[PDB]
Specification:
Oligomer: homodimer
Largest sheet of chain A: 6 strands, mixed
Bound molecules: sodium ion
PDB class: transferase
Keywords: Trypanosoma cruzi, Chagas disease, transferase
Number of helices of chain A: 15
Number of domains of chain A: 2
Number of strands of chain A: 15
Assembly: dimeric
Helix content of chain A: 25-40%
Shape of chain A: globular
Strand order of the largest sheet of chain A: 1-4-3-2-5-9
Structural class of chain A: alpha/beta
Entry title: Crystal structure of Trypanosoma cruzi glucokinase in the apo form (open conformation)
Chains A, B: Glucokinase 1, putative
Amino acid sequence: MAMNIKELSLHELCEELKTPAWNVPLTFVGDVGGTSARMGFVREGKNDSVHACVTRYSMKRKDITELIEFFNEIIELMPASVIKRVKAGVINVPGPVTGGAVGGPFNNLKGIARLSDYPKALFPPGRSAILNDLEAGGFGVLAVSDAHVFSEYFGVMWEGTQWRTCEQEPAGSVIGRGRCLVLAPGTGLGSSLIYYNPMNQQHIVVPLELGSQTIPMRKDIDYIQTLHAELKLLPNYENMVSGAGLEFHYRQVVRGSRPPCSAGEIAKLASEGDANACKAMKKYHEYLMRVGSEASMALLPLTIVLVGDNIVNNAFFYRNPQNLKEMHREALNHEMERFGFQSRVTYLRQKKLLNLNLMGCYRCGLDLS
Amino acid sequence: MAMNIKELSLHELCEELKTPAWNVPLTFVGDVGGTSARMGFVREGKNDSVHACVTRYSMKRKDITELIEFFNEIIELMPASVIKRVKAGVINVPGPVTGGAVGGPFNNLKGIARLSDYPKALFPPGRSAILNDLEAGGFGVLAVSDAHVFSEYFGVMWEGTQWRTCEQEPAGSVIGRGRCLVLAPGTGLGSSLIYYNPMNQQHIVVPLELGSQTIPMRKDIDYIQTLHAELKLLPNYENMVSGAGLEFHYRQVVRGSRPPCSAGEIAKLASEGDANACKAMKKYHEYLMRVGSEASMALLPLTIVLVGDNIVNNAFFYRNPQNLKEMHREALNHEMERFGFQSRVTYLRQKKLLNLNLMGCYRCGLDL
Ligand code: NA
């Protein structure tokens, strides 16, 4: 396997790092969420394979500063001769970061993540970074491409007109040397743009906030105004493309004839062929494709990639050719499609689970050398 | 005088390049438009100063390949001693470019711009590129900052909350260690993002098409639908923020009471205190700030800079505090301003004429 993540106890992780396969350069990585963090070491294997060994920590104190205790424990327990092989240290955190060094504040954790407070043995000076979740996820998409297994983790929804001019390899086999917009439609709607800088031969990841933009209309002014009156706020993309959004779409389908359902309930009903829930899912994806059509114009991407557990878990929806035709039609529903802008773009979807954030911490550390 | 662009005849340019001040390394630059090109040489002076000398060429044949005849004429006329000093060659063209080497196709010009067809005396190997004009414009904003005279060329419209959190120097004194969204509201509406890579402190120019985005509403559904019915297209930002857009705003302000005027006429009447033309300019700037409020959220810029001759020529509008306060209010008219996102951003406007494209060709050549 090209992408390998083993989860162990701290004590077992220490035994694994003394084995001969681990007597190589290391990257220290950490994927920090609201409840737990998964931290450890990544190495290269054969044919650009990626091998990670990580341990889980509970964020017991609901305090981002507790990470420093975890880092100190790792350095205290591991032999200095193992930690000496660390060449880079990258974590992702569930909130905004500045200077790649100062993360927060956070919705569900107290305090600020400060790279200058982290131990230099795991975070070597000038070869370390803190990333936002979506920035790490974008670097994770690049990592999958670099490991030659894009076609294992991503499926082509449709090939856009630009692909064969810009690239030699088949669509979906590599990320491509063109801008890649990463969208993460889940509870909310994360976005990041993977740019290739010709001058530097570097890819970089630009975190965005596309989800918080005001939804522009098509022929849906009454539908937008319905949600406007409910929220008391002009709707943004995430308001239509979110759990809350899917709940809204389902309420607007059934018009009081059925009880209101959660996003989870609705997706389950859709998977079972319920006409109402399927219609709610079509409406959710109509607004997702609106983000896509407008960002296709604004950002001129070669590719749009839909990532996350939700996308993988909803594979039934993307495999259905009628749903795919309806999504493609909405992706092209833009006045600028008379010039071909929306049809230029190749759309892909994640089809296999992977911790993209852990892989992206690793991939980001490679550009720090 | 830290940034100096002088226009000369070809013969006077040849005489100038033989003077002692020009006996230094040179960059060959060219700003290619639909009707003319300005091309010439740039040198560094004292204190990171920039000095350029350029000539105007007519794009008589409306054919991008005519540039090669201009390049060959310059090489034939200049002494070998002058051409020997050229260490980089960068031009910008009004259309898409791939691999920094192949430009076009173009709306207003025939043919394809091919770097591989250009003479190596003006475009030395490893050191040459073709740029899209939006890219060149963003490199030009960086050039101004690098020459230490941002406060000469750009005025602060208002300072946002984020500036003082990552810069100690006054707002408008330098580009800043943050994303800069460049907007060029002129005949149309150009956009690029000068992205800031925190991990290596690198500014990277990323051309965009924000003008072609469908306009999201505020309390203006009727106004947008009036334009929709005229264009038979859902309005995009450029449709409201363009010469055509200003002519539209003036038509709607007067409600038939005056015949239509051109965009230039409207700006002139506004400068003279005509209430109708002033209201038309307010409406233009209201949609320009909508681009700003939405992009302030989507792209999280440190700064937004309004560039171009049109901005400099309309100085009177931005000098008026009532107009500036009404622009500030629209810039903050976003649901996400309840969290302070729009108040983060510093807005600046170009206040002195400068060919940013020619400066960007130079500054891009420094990154090669
Ligand atoms: Na553990």
